[PDB]
Design a protein around this ligand. Structure first.
Ligand SMILES: C[C@@H]1O[C@@H](O[C@@H]2[C@@H](O)[C@@H](O)[C@@H](CO)O[C@H]2O)[C@@H](O)[C@H](O)[C@@H]1O
Lengths: 307, 315
């Protein structure tokens, strides 16, 4: 029975599985009223990828496809319809048991980045772009999305197109940023399918523990963050190892290697998320050279040492 | 001795260690005249990072720092000076034995990306939240103003005014601005990390085949362009996931050369073999330039430690 393990990469050596950002802090928010059901950064402890999760850090919130039509929006500038493929270039088959192409964004918001094209030496262009994932035109499970640009004309149709994500366009009221609200992958009247399950503590006094990254903004006021359940390197490790889960809950300890001291402990649940016994919201203050070490398999009734 | 291993990753599951791009193809170019001495994606088989190599995919060709002021520069655009720190925010100490802050670009060219800022000061009427901005930007790494080992670089924008002095600044790389002759793209020419006319130091060593008939094998990614004609590529010696794997394993190297086989998981067959050298690079027996045409579900499997006398089966 291949023993279970976590990477020994430290906090300052990890990246977010839901947006291409470094991990900045560990974070809790016990009074969260939203159902937590993100679709990127989802992997079971025995290495099963779920939701829209894929392995490439470059694939998170990325799209590939081709533009088909230009449409001026009445309020939000120039829009472009885009057919999307899988990130490996193959056609996306909507009958596969996934919510949307792997890497599709998993939250409501205006995602800011750059659209680039290299024609089928070829000509090239790139421009800043925004994808409103709450729009009725955001239908990646149906093979098509829309993006908008400040550029009014220089986007070509029928040519290979890449979206490289960079941050958010805004977090104003009118920009519908909510990291826990899933897009409607097939449009508003259609149910999402093949989702990774929601996650929650099941024991009193526990809360979820997140790996938090602060996300850039194109403009406006705000200090937005994206919280993932496990960093991308954990997804990659678990997929590689595929170690059998010996119970439903692993016990992990956050350790300071220099002193060898454990700073706190957490439950790492089979479905791929952490809980801690903490009754406060906000960052965990601890060294970014610290790291989680697997201790032993426990169960849902194990009582964590309070933080 | 802890056994040496590689990750199990098809080519379609790997990313470049020299720019944030997926690996697209394996590639050779035996008649390359340049010295190959890249500084990102450098790690020995026993897990020693070298050059400017760091572990985060988000840190490759990234900078963090603060804009100081707008500057005049004969070249087109609006120019800005920025101090740079280490990527983790701590001050860069030029006395450390590295060529430049980890993650600094390792090639000559006009690197295109986005500069973003989140102000330090907050506004009460905005919920005690800071103002933000982002704009497209270009960093010419051949410029005399590209001096990351001195803690300072310059970037240019199309935007003419909306970049703030004294505020935290991030550069997110996206591609190249141009590959015209006037944009000095050369993936094997290192920047002058301390400026015009200074010698770079603390470099990861150059790599080469030493056995007749062998050439370097690269993990190639095609890099986006802001404009112009071209199909530029960036070639790395090992993908970022191998750097990450070797760093964590730190398995002792039992000879100077690990024999690896590129295997198709579905067929089970070996497509070709290669030497994986101690300093962290591959050679193959091949006498042509261009892509290696093989499925992207293929992967390298470690077979055994051999020595430099070993003769590879021709590809
Ligand atoms: C707070 C500011 O954000 C951006 O300014 C934006 C303006 O350019 C304009 O588009 C309005 C439209 O509603 O939105 C603003 O947010 C930054 O460009 C500026 O520097 C401020 O940080």
């Amino acid at each position: 029975s291949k023993p279970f393990t976590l990477p020994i990469l430290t906090l300052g050596e990890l990246t977010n599985s839901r947006f291409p950002l470094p991990i900045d802090v560990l974070y809790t928010n016990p009074n969260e009223s939203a159902i937590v059901q993100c679709q990127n950064g989802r992997c079971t402890l025995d290495g099963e990828l779920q939701g829209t999760t894929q392995l490439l850090p470059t694939g998170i919130c990325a799209f590939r496809g081709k533009v088909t039509q230009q449409v001026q929006d009445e309020h939000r500038g120039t829009h472009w319809n885009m057919t999307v493929t899988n990130l490996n270039g193959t056609p996306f088959d909507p009958t596969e048991d996934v919510p949307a192409p792997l890497g599709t964004p998993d939250f409501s918001g205006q995602i800011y980045g750059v659209i680039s094209q290299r024609n089928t030496l070829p000509a090239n262009r790139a421009h800043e772009a925004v994808i409103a994932t709450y729009s009725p035109k955001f239908t990646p499970k149906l093979g098509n999305i829309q993006f908008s640009t400040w550029e009014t004309q220089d986007v070509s149709s029928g040519q290979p197109t890449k979206f490289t994500p960079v941050g958010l366009a805004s977090v104003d009221a009118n920009s519908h940023f909510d990291q826990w609200t899933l897009p409607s992958y097939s449009g508003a009247l259609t149910l999402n399918m093949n989702l990774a399950p929601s996650v929650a503590p099941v024991f009193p006094g526990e809360c979820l523990l997140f790996f938090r990254s602060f996300i850039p903004l194109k403009g406006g006021y705000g200090n937005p963050a994206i919280d993932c359940l496990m960093p991308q390197e954990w997804v990659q490790h678990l997929y590689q190892e595929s170690a059998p889960s010996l119970s439903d809950v692993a016990l992990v300890r956050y350790v300071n290697p220099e002193t060898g001291r454990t700073l706190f402990e957490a439950k790492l649940h089979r479905n791929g998320f952490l809980t801690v016994a903490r009754n406060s919201a906000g960052p965990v203050v601890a060294p970014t050279n610290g790291y989680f070490r697997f201790d032993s398999w426990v169960n849902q009734f194990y009582t964590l040492a309070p933080m």
